């Protein structure tokens, strides 16, 4: 009974997350086919993704539970199709802002994909099905990155034809979406946990770490373009992305397997990994070596998954499955608020309008400051 919805959802997720053009977005946007400047991409286009994601988050959550999930998933597929159609044939800065708005809509709709299985799968089968869907998405992204690198290097394909493959993949995923069973119920519509201090503390770090991680991810490719202009040197954005994703997945798997009291060792290890994230970001900033910037990105992505995995394990240790949804929804909303404030102040043209050559000094400082403040309260 659980096999059919699970297999269909896993097929949709795999084909939606398989996007060979995602590692080479900056080389594509700044290439001859779009002629977008680095300042325009970083301080006018890219910030719009955070704004739309923050604005659309809560309404999409409320719509999802009430419409029984499936319709939102189909909407996510439609948004994927529109986003890549615009990416393939769009032109100018305004069109890219529309693309960013639709991508933010796509991201805000990902809650339906993971919340869908609750209403169609028995509570006894929740763990394995959720693990299956997460692993399928991770494998899809890694395979897409590896294929993107293989085609660019060996096959010699252009960045235009990488977006054609992504459009075909998302179209197939949408075609898979129209066959999922309609959920017959929902957790809230169709059926005070923060009072605990531990939940508040762990939620805070998760929210702040997630904000920093998403801010760094949105601009890491622009930093690589700055250090190694794509138009004159060989680039390995697919291989680097694939290796970083695999390292993060291995770190997340390792966290679960090794058994240790995270009530006592949680804060020390967390602070250490925040310091490691700060050091990797500082290396990315200062280092003039493109290989060192790749290594720093790998270290940051692997260490963050070491961090967020422990944070999520500590948050959900006592929460109910019903409470997972709203607690984590609030936590991602607050992380989006923090990221929006950061983007407005730093990256936005209405703030400091800082180029990518200085942003990563602010992100390393951000992570170091996170670790420093969290370290306090020890004595006195």
């Amino acid at each position, epitope marked *: 009974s659980w096999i059919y919805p699970t297999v269909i959802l896993c097929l949709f997720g795999f084909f939606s997350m398989m996007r060979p053009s995602e590692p080479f977005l900056i080389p594509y946007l700044s290439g001859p086919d779009k*002629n977008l400047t680095s*300042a325009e991409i970083t301080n006018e286009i890219f910030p719009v993704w955070t704004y739309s994601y923050l604005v659309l988050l809560l309404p999409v959550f409320v719509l999802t539970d009430y419409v029984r999930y499936k319709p939102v998933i189909i909407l996510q597929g439609i948004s994927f199709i529109i986003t890549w159609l615009l990416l393939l044939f769009g032109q*100018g*800065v*305004k069109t890219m802002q529309v693309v960013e708005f639709f991508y933010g809509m796509v991201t805000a709709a990902e809650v339906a994909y993971y919340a869908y299985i609750y209403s169609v799968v028995s509570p006894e089968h929740y763990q394995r099905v959720s693990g299956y869907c997460r692993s399928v998405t991770l494998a899809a992204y890694t395979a897409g990155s590896v294929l993107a690198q293989l085609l660019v290097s060996l096959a010699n394909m252009s960045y235009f034809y990488l977006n054609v493959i992504s459009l075909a993949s998302v179209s197939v995923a949408f075609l898979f979406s129209l066959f999922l069973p309609m959920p017959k119920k929902s957790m809230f519509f169709h059926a005070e946990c923060y009072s605990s201090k531990r939940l508040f503390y762990w939620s805070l770090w998760w929210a702040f770490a997630t904000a920093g991680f998403n801010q760094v991810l949105n601009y890491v490719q622009i930093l690589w373009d700055y250090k190694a202009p794509s138009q004159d040197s060989s680039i390995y954005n697919g291989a680097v992305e694939a290796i970083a994703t695999f390292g993060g997945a291995v770190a997340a798997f390792a966290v679960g397997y090794v058994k240790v009291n995270w009530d006592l060792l949680g804060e020390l290890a967390l602070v250490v990994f925040s310091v490691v994230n700060a050091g990797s970001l500082f290396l990315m900033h200062y280092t003039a070596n493109i290989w060192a910037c790749y290594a720093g990105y790998l270290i940051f992505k692997s260490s963050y998954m070491l961090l967020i995995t422990i944070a999520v394990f500590q948050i959900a240790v006592n929460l109910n499955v019903e409470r997972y949804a709203l607690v984590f929804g609030i936590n991602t909303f607050i992380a989006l608020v923090i990221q929006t404030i950061m983007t407005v102040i730093v990256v936005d043209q209405r703030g*400091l309008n800082l180029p990518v*050559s200085i942003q990563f000094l602010v992100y390393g400082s951000y992570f170091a400051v996170i670790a420093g403040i969290f370290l306090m309260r020890s004595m006195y």
Partner: nanobody
Amino acid sequence: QVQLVESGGGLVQAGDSLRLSCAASGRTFSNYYMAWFRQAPGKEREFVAAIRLSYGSTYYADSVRGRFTISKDNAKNTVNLRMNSLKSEDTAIYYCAAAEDRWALAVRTATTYNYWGQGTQVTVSS
């Protein structure tokens, strides 16, 4: 007082190219936004391209994107604009403007620039 002066505009056959140079003076210019605007008869003043002198960041309007490139020859305190594959829709008077670098600077809004040139005309004949 800052003083912007342009040169290079002229009568150019449609499809050809043209270069425009705006030499700022009266001050040491390292923390200024230097931009180009244009105005044709019966229309409003339109952004063309801008450059950040400190960081070298460049901005373009989608109308001229891919054809116009804005650079900086600091050796003479001049910001240059090269125009390629000109069309009849590019006929206008071009004004280079200078804005001080500061917090919350709208690069493409003409009201942001407090110094403006006398305007050099570029008429494109087909």
